[PDB]
């Protein structure tokens, strides 16, 4: 009778050991992770890269007759037939100027390049930048690097490219960061006389705060800043460390592209776009990098834009961009105050030779800074490692039957002898 | 002497095994969890539901003599004696209109319904919606579905109700989302001539971005959008998975409510409120769902409001709403640009036959989109499961005394004799 | 032949036990932690303290000839030679007033000057409502910061009970209508480091346990808008060494009962300024003597800037283990509505332009009646380590602590 109770206890114990052990094994093969959040104080923080664009792609006063000839239909100033669209709400001077520029009689077309047009017709930082201050000391327009985006000629402060050393800040708060007073030059905006999908009614700038390791993607990752306010941006540096497969989904390998030195999801996307357009249309857009020939406005109309839209719509499998394992992101909180005060409106108007109306509808102040001298860390941490797995399997294996690997080896010994 | 030192080692070892084992047991019975954060890239994202209200509950030009008679005191247009308050700082025409509507001389009232009044007097989406675009293609006012909230007649785009399929976006950025130009119709706002509790000075709209599985709750979960700016809302889809008891506190079961098909904490709140008002006052407000009769403005005055306030303070224990285990939330970052530009202001003024003053103080553009084509997941994960408990207990039990469950069974066997 | 493979199996198995066991040992000695996020619903939330400053340090109409004499250079109204700045873009009345006050023919405490000349809450506060009930200016407590005379609602200091809210949403919080008094702003006639073009207020929402640090931790609120602040209460619990880096022991400073990172920072600043210049600035607390404007010019400011740059290691402030933070999302609507502009202009005896350029409404509330908890939790405790070492020790060689003791015995005998 005792051998029966022993047999039932050993059988049930071996069954429980079986299901518990297979439980821990299956849990191990899920490759699970859990998250570790930490806050690290620092005496210094590397200041991020700040890219801003004027919402107006190019200035109206800088457009020439040749530009209307080649890129007039693309720029939406002229219709398909090289004629001005409906003149509704057209200033007499502006309409006479454009009609004169669109004469096109005995006109020998000069050679045309899209990057020349954006480079010269775009808003000049030497004209927009009314004042610059970083950590209380003056900054020059030479700190801003020219970047070409979908929005046109844009500028990146502290880009850290072309051998410039990256700036640091040793104090937090509103004073100890970037602070620029800009004139968006609303007088240079393209006149809108007829409705279009590309037609926009917005006035102001677009800013993206990003690491120097990633290129700007201002059409998607930017936020707006409106004239007439000082906008405060409190930043918090976040350092992210991810896990590669099979735990998570990250690019462990650098997987460096020909266009960009450091891998970033943004660089991977704009790389995919650049390659797709170069293969499909034998030309490259203005914002894209490399050594390919830039597209002509005819190529823009008949190939480039529908090619990108078709790439977006047809299938995402062509462009699959994994996230890198080490990522520095910047968190931000926005607030606003009114500019200028009544006590300063006249002083600004006289300092820059503008009307107080113009100052009111054209001046914006951007104040980007770190809230405090610390950074957050978000790390994916492996939840079950092989040492812990063997420890748990050994513990339960010793609890239920008290056996060891040598014991099973001895049982296989007797099985071999049989 | 060897057996004595052996006895000391066995005693200390058994004590340590005791305290360590009880430690792991108690830690297991705390039912602890820890959090797993992950970020997943996706080729498509299901666009959320977007509900917006005008901050002005109903249009002044659509209020009628009957409306003033029945709900004049409730709408704050008339005083306790059904008479207009002090005419100080009142435009002559504006007051002539109100005084004419409030004559009440030889006036035979008609039947009156609060929901009819909001549906007819509220701001019409066909008039507010100056332009609509989703993923670069035009949308109609018929795409917006009428929902009644505390703010009045409100509208939900991509509501996904009445059999409509939920919309997806295949690209991120400012262009590839919802983008509407709205006219808040500040000329239709209720006149403020005298101080009152209901008096508000704001003009603009209020928006809530929410999952299709939940009804809007704009009076608490909404953010404001001001005229004269194009407001960008960058959204980040978050997928949350919680743990039920005893680990955490979530609703494991569906918890079917009569009013709503899918359970949400918001639906639970307005369910508690609706049930409470139906039980105490036998009527439901306009925003509440169901088949109960709508309240009369007298019922609003003498029962509903004090009942809700008493529900807020006295019965704070009475309404306990548990959070669902799988929740889709949307995070948002707001930014603004100025509208209109000087190059477009006059074109807008002539296109919509308005003065530039009106465009300046009445037009706002709302741009809702996904920052990137990805979503975060925040999961509560069990920190100590029974397999790990048995493994640790077996490990320490085998380290300190080398015993097993069969060993303790044999000790009870020898004790049996 | 069987004993040889048995011996090799024991050797390799003991090697595996060695490397796995030392693996868990090293992992335990990393003292790792992981984060536990939770969301807790509540019937009540303690409402925070809200400190705000006007961006303009002091009112122009309240400055007097004595104030111009003593603090004229510091206030930037007068130059080094006690002369009015460039007369470009100078209001005729303002310039005549300043020239009269700067007559200096036949003609001071910093805190008296800030306390009396600063913006009075009794004039700025056009309306107050908390949870739908009226509040008075007496509810705001005066705190002196770098921006000057500032005010804290629900400060909870001097034994006042902290306010609670039993409902969430825009209505059920603090709601104040303020007039920033842009006419009282210092006239700006020449470029200066202190020269500012902003108009509005700066706010910091913080727990009553920490002092305000509004010049660094504040956000702006612009006139002409009602800005909503949705708050989410977060309760954070960190780990002390060797797990993380926290101050487990409160270690309260003499100035304030409860320790906070901000309080530690301003304490370090006060101590440094007292050591180098034997005086304290207006914002600093304590019983020390306040600086004279000459002391400000020749000692205080360069001492503070040098303290910031020269020795950042000198002030090391550890973070407390229990920290209550408040998250916030801002949004705006336009104020006043066209239907209300006339009523506001007439109610407060101002022009509609003045209302447009001077009135702001601040609405601070909890989005919902819940708070988040973020806990650092120990990932490997000594019980788990001993359990794992015991499990692998029993799996690989099946030994125990008694087995190693007996091996020491048998080795001792032979
Ligand atoms: C991610 O960044 C870390 C540095 O922050 C890189 O190197 C790590 O440096 C720390 C020093 O404290 C070591 O403890 C880690 O073991 C290092 N990790 C590695 C993988 O060497 C790390 O290399 C970076 N990872 C990637 C993929 O670039
Ligand atoms: C309403 O405002 C007017 C103008 O601001 C007040 O009249 C002046 O008030 C100032 C105080 O700021 C006095 O110094 C002037 O002497 C007043 N003079 C004139 C001619 O108005 C007026 O007192 C305010 N109050 C009322 C009830 O009208
Ligand atoms: C101000 O700028 C305009 C720009 O055309 C110029 O014509 C004018 O001469 C300038 N005035 C002064 C005083 O510089
Ligand atoms: C949660 O899962 C259930 C599964 O039946 C589903 O019906 C429900 O819609 C889900 N909720 C959310 C918010 O995804
Ligand atoms: C434009 O509005 C005016 C009144 O503001 C009206 O008289 C006129 O008929 C309107 N024109 C059109 C084309 O609707
Ligand atoms: C620290 O915070 C925890 C979490 O709310 C609380 O339980 C504990 O009492 C706090 N410690 C104190 C107040 O000393
Ligand atoms: Ca500044
Ligand atoms: Ca932070
Ligand atoms: Ca757009
Ligand atoms: Ca994100
Ligand atoms: Ca309100
Ligand atoms: Ca929340
Ligand atoms: Cl997992
Ligand atoms: Cl670690």
Residue C128 backbone dihedrals phi, psi, to 5 degrees: -135, 140
Task: Kindly state the helix (H) or strand (E) to which residue C9 belongs, with its residue range.
Answer: helix C2-29
CB contact under 8 A, C218 and A342: no
Domain residue extents for chain B: 1-32+383-417, 33-55+124-184+205-241+326-382, 56-123+185-204, 242-325
Q: What is the 3-state secondary structure (H, E, C) of chain B?
A: CHHHHHHHHHHHHHHHHHHHHHHHHHHHHCCCEEEEEEEEECCCEECCEEEEEECCCCCCCCCCHHHHHHHCCCCCCCCCCCCCCCCCCCCHHHHHHHHHHCCCCCCCCCCCCHHHHHHHHCCCHHHHEEEEEECCEECCHHHEEEEEECCEEEEEECCCCCCCCCCEECCCCCCCCEEEEEECCHHHCCCCCCCCCCCCCCECEEEEEECCCCCCCHHHHCEEECCCEEEEEEEEEEEEECCCCCCCCEECCCCCCCCCCCCCHHHHHHHHHHHHHHHHHCCECCCCCCCCCECCHHHHHHHHHHHHHHHHHCCCCCCCCCEECEEEEEEEEEEEEECCCHHHHHHHHHHCCCCHHHHHHHEEEEEEEEEEEEEEEEEEEECCCHHHHHHHHHHHHHHHCCCCHHHHHHHHHHHHC
- Identify the CA nearest to A244 among candidates A324, A150, A139, A164: A324
Residues A343 and A209 sit within 8 Å (Cβ to Cβ): no
Q: Which three-class secondary structure string do you get for chain A?
A: CHHHHHHHHHHHHHHHHHHHHHHHHHHHHCCCEEEEEEEEECCCEECCEEEEEECCCCCCCCCCHHHHHHHCCCCCCCCCCCCCCCCCCCCHHHHHHHHHHCCCCCCCCCCCCHHHHHHHHCCCHHHHEEEEEECCEECCHHHEEEEEECCEEEEEECCCCCCCCCCEECCCCCCCCEEEEEECCHHHCCCCCCCCCCCCCCECEEEEEECCCCCCCHHHHCEEECCCEEEEEEEEEEEEECCCCCCCCCECCCCCCCCCCCCCHHHHHHHHHHHHHHHHHCCECCCCCCCCCECCHHHHHHHHHHHHHHHHHHCCCCCCCCCECEEEEEEEEEEEEECCCHHHHHHHHHHCCCCHHHHHHHEEEEEEEEEEEEEEEEEEEECCCHHHHHHHHHHHHHHHCCCCHHHHHHHHHHHHHC
- Residue A77's CB is within 10 A of a number of other CB atoms, namely 20
User: Cα separations (Å) of A392 from A22, B387, B393, B408, C71?
Assistant: 11, 8, 9, 20, 74
Cis peptide before C242 (omega within 30 of 0): yes
- Measuring from atom 6 of ligand 1, which residue has the nearest CA? A326
Give the closest ligand to the alpha carbon of residue C328: 12
Ligand nearest to the CA of C226: 11
Q: Which chains are adjacent to chain A, needing at least 3 Cβ pairs under 8 Å? A: B, C
Peptide bond into C57 cis (omega under 30): no
From ligand 14's centre to the CA of B385, what distance in Å?
A: 22
Angle at C268 between CA C263 and CA C273, to 5 degrees: 125
Rg (CA), chain A: 31
In chain C, which residues have their Cβ closer than 8 Å to the Cβ of A174?
215-216, 218
CA atoms within 13 A on the CB side of B318: 12
What distance in Å separates residue A216's CA from the closest CA in chain B?
13
Determine which residue's CA is closest to atom 12 belonging to ligand 6: C322
Q: Is the CB of C235 under 6 A from ligand 6?
A: yes
Cα–Cα distance measured from residue A308 to residue B393, given in angstroms and rounded to the nearest whole number:
60
CA B365/CA B180 separation, integer angstroms: 6
Q: Which fold has domain C238-321?
A: Helix Hairpins (1.10.287)
Which segments of C239-389 are extended strands (E)? Answer: 322-334, 359-378
Best residue in B52, B229, B398 for a mutation probing chain C (most C CBs within 10 Å): B398
Give the Cα separation of B410 and B397 in Å (integer).
15
- Dihedral angle of Cα B283, B288, B293, B296, to the nearest 10 degrees: 60
DSSP classification of residue C35: E
Quick one: which atom of ligand 4 is closest to the CA of B262? 9
Find out whether the peptide bond into B312 is cis, omega within 30 degrees of 0.
no
Say what the resolution is, in angstroms.
3.2
Residue nearest to atom 2 of ligand 4 (CA): B326
A325 lines ligand 1 (CB under 6 A): yes
Rounded to whole angstroms, the Cα distance separating A55 from A184 reads: 9
How far is it, in rounded angstroms, from Cα C157 to Cα C151?
A: 13
**In the structure encoding, which two tokens stand for residue B103, read together?**
């004559």
Distance, CA of C392 to CA of C399 (rounded, Å)? 10
Residue numbers of A between 14 and 53 with CB closer than 8 Å to C: 34-39, 41, 43-44
Query: Please, what CATH class does the domain formed by C33-55+120-180+201-237+322-378 belong to?
Result: mainly beta
Tokens representing A366? 């951007």
Q: Would an 8 Å CB–CB cutoff place C326 in contact with chain A?
A: no
User: For chain C, what's the residue count?
Assistant: 414
- Beta bridge pairs of residue B49: B210
Q: Buried b vs exposed e over B396-409: b needs ≥16 C-beta within 10 Å?
A: bbbbbbbbbbbeee
Which chain C residue is nearest to residue B10, measuring alpha carbons?
C402
Closest-CA distance, C17 to chain A, in angstroms, reads: 9
CA of C226 to the centre of ligand 11 (A): 9
Inter-residue long-range contacts of B76-83, CB under 8 Å, 24+ positions, other chains counted = B76/B190, B76/B196, B76/B198, B76/B199, B77/B102, B77/B190, B78/B102
Cα B231 to chain centroid distance, Å, stands at 20
Helix or strand run (H / E) with residue C344: helix C341-347
Which helix (H) or strand (E) segment is C128 a member of?
A: strand C125-130
Contacts of C195 in chain A (CB under 8 A): 344
Experimental approach: X-ray
Which 48-77 residues of chain A touch chain B by CB within 8 A?
Answer: 55-56
Distance CA A161, CA A373 (A): 24
In whole angstroms, give the CA distance from residue C102 to residue C64: 9
Q: Would the CA dihedral through C20, C22, C25, C30 be positive or negative?
A: negative
Architecture of domain B242-325: Orthogonal Bundle (1.10)
Q: Is the distance from CB of A214 to CB of A267 less than 8 angstroms?
A: yes
Q: Is the Cβ atom of B213 under 6 angstroms away from ligand 4?
A: yes
Which pair of structure tokens corresponds to residue A155?
């500028």
Residues A94, A86: Cα–Cα separation, whole Å: 14
Tell me the shortest Cα–Cα distance from C233 to chain A, in angstroms.
Answer: 17
Q: Do B229 and A226 touch (CB under 8 A)?
A: yes
Give the distance (Å) from ligand 5 centre to CA of residue B183: 17
Bridge-based pairing of strands A49-54 and A205-210 is antiparallel
Instruction: Count Cβ atoms below 10 Å from residue C74 Cβ, excluding itself.
Output: 19
d(CA B48, CA B159): 8
> Is ligand 6 within 6 A of the CB of residue C324?
no
User: What is the distance between the alpha carbons of residues B50 and C79, in angstroms, rounded to a whole number?
Assistant: 57
How many CB pairs (< 8 A) connect B and C? 191
Say which ligand is closest to the CA of B352: 5
Superfamily (CATH H level) for A1-32+383-418: YojJ-like (1.10.287.770)
Q: Give the pair of three-digit tokens for residue A338.
A: 């009114």
Residue B401 and residue C405: Cβ atoms within 8 Å? no
Ligand 8 ion: nearby residues, β-carbon < 5 Å: A 236
Spatial distance between the Cα atoms of A175 and A367, rounded to a whole number of angstroms: 8
Domain pair C1-32+379-414 / C238-321, same fold: yes
B323 part of contact set with chain C, CB < 8 Å:
yes
Is A357 at the interface with chain C, CB within 8 A? no
Which H or E run includes C277?
A: helix C261-277
d(CA B340, CA A199): 12
CATH class in words for A33-55+124-184+205-241+326-382: mainly beta
Note whether A271 and A257 are within 8 A (CB): yes
What is the Cα–Cα distance from B302 to B313, expressed in whole angstroms?
18
Neighbours of ion ligand 14 (CB under 5 A): C 32
Which of B333, B338, B405 shows the shortest C-beta gap to A226?
B338
Alpha-carbon gap, residue C6 to C22, rounded angstroms: 24
> Among residues B78, B64, B58, B63, which one has the least CA distance to residue B107?
B64
Q: B56-123+185-204: which CATH topology? A: acid-sensing ion channel 1 fold (1.10.3590)
Pair of tokens at residue B353:
């036959």
DSSP classification of residue C296: I
According to DSSP, residue C232 is labeled: E
Domain boundaries C1-32+379-414, CATH class:
mainly alpha
The length of chain A is 418
User: For chain B, what's the residue count?
Assistant: 417
Q: Does A417 touch chain C (CB under 8 A)?
A: no
**Sequential DSSP letters for C175-216:** EEEEE--GGGSPP--S--TT----BSEEEEEE-TTS---HHH
Count Cα neighbours of B383 within 13 Å in the Cβ-side half-sphere. Answer: 26
B332 touches chain C (CB under 8 A): yes
Residue pair B238/C345 in contact (Cβ under 8 Å)? The answer is no
Q: Are residues C280 and C273 in contact, defined by beta-carbon separation less than 8 angstroms?
A: yes
Tokens of C246: 């926290």
Residue A351 alpha carbon to ligand 3 centre in Å: 12
**What's the CA-to-centroid distance between A191 and ligand 9, angstroms?**
16
* C40: alpha, beta or left? (left if phi > 0; alpha if psi -120 to 50): beta
- C300 Cβ partners below 8 Å, 6+ apart? C273, C277, C279, C281, C291
* Ligand 4 site, residue B238, Cβ cutoff 6 A: no
Tokens (6 digits) for A336: 């606003």
Dig out the tokens for B82 from the structure.
């059904």
Going by their DSSP bridges, the two strands C49-54 and C148-153 should be labelled as: antiparallel
C339–B189 C-beta distance less than 8 A: yes
The single residue listed with the structure tokens 């937090």 is A172
Q: Which DSSP state fits C63?
A: -
State the sign of the Cα–Cα–Cα–Cα dihedral C162, C168, C172, C174: positive
Pick the CATH number of C56-119+181-200 from 2.40.50.140, 2.60.40.2130, 1.10.20.10, 1.10.3590.10: 1.10.3590.10
Q: Which residue reads 């015991």 in tokens?
A: C390
CATH 1.10.10.60 fits B1-32+383-417, yes or no: no
Residue A159, token pair as written in the block: 């880009």
B265 vs C368: CA distance, rounded Å: 11
Distances in Å between the Cα of B57 and the Cα atoms of B129, B147, C338 are: 17, 13, 15
């Amino acid at each position: 009778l005792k051998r029966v109770v022993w047999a039932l206890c050993f059988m049930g114990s071996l069954a429980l050991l079986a299901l518990v052990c297979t439980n821990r094994i299956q849990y191990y093969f899920l490759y699970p992770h859990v998250t570790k959040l930490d806050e690290v104080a620092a005496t210094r923080l590397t200041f991020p890269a700040v890219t801003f664009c004027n919402l107006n792609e190019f200035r109206f006063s800088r457009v020439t007759k040749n530009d209307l000839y080649h890129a007039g239909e693309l720029l939406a100033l002229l219709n398909n037939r090289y004629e001005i669209p409906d003149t509704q709400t057209a200033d007499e001077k502006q309409l006479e100027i454009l009609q004169d520029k669109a004469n096109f009689r005995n006109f020998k077309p000069k050679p045309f390049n899209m990057l020349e047009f954006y480079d010269r017709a775009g808003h000049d930082i030497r004209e927009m930048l009314l004042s610059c201050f970083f950590r209380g000391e003056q900054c020059s327009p030479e700190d801003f690097k020219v970047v070409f985006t979908r929005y046109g000629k844009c500028y990146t402060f502290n880009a850290g490219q072309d051998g410039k050393p990256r700036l640091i800040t040793m104090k937090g708060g509103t004073g100890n960061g970037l602070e620029i007073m800009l004139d968006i030059q609303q007088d240079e905006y393209l006149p809108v006389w007829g409705e279009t999908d590309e037609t926009s009614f917005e006035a102001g700038i677009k800013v993206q705060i990003h690491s120097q390791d990633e290129p700007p993607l201002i059409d998607q990752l930017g936020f707006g800043v409106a004239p007439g306010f000082q906008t405060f941006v409190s930043c918090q540096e976040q350092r992210l460390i991810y896990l590669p497969p099979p735990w998570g989904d990250c690019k462990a390998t650098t997987g460096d592209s020909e266009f960009y030195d450091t891998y970033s999801i943004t660089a991977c996307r704009i790389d995919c776009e650049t390659r797709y357009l170069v293969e499909n249309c034998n030309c490259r857009m203005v914002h894209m990098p490399g050594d390919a020939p830039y597209c002509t406005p005819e190529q823009y109309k008949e190939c480039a834009d529908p090619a990108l839209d078709f790439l977006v719509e047809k299938d995402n499998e062509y462009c699959v961009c994994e996230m890198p394992c080490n990522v520095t992101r910047y968190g931000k909180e926005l607030s606003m105050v009114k500019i200028p005060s009544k006590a300063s409106a006249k002083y600004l108007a006289k300092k820059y030779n503008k009307s107080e109306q113009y100052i009111g509808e054209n001046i914006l102040v951007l104040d980007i800074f770190f809230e405090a001298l610390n950074y957050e860390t978000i790390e994916q941490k492996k939840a079950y490692e092989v040492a812990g797995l063997l420890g748990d399997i050994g513990g339960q294996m010793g609890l239920f039957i008290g056996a060891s690997i040598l014991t099973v080896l001895e049982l296989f010994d007797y099985a071999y002898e049989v």
